[PDB]
Design a protein around this ligand. Sequence first.
Ligand SMILES: N[C@@H](Cn1cc([N+](=O)[O-])c(=O)[nH]c1=O)C(=O)O
Lengths: 48, 48
Amino acid sequence: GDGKYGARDADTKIWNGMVGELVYGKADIAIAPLTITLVREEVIDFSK
Amino acid sequence: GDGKYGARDADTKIWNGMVGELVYGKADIAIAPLTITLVREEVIDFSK
Ligand SMILES: N[C@@H](Cn1cc([N+](=O)[O-])c(=O)[nH]c1=O)C(=O)O
């Protein structure tokens, strides 16, 4: 929707982007050039 | 114990090396230049 990868807002604590459409249930699997980071490995699972 | 990395025998179905000393309960964690492969992930978990 918002055309973004994914990072957490510092204020609203709201995850946006691809990651956001996962943790909020709006999608099941994410296939895109998403970068494996720490804060992301905490909220979602990553393949190799 | 055998100085090997970790591969499975095709005849006897045994795991040698560090993968083996993990799957057979000899060690708790394998910190070494151990290549992440499809067959190795199938018996022991790998970190990123
Ligand atoms: N690390 C690899 C084993 N391994 C090691 C070396 N090495 O010693 O640099 C190599 O050249 N090639 C190889 O397959 C593995 O874990 O399978």
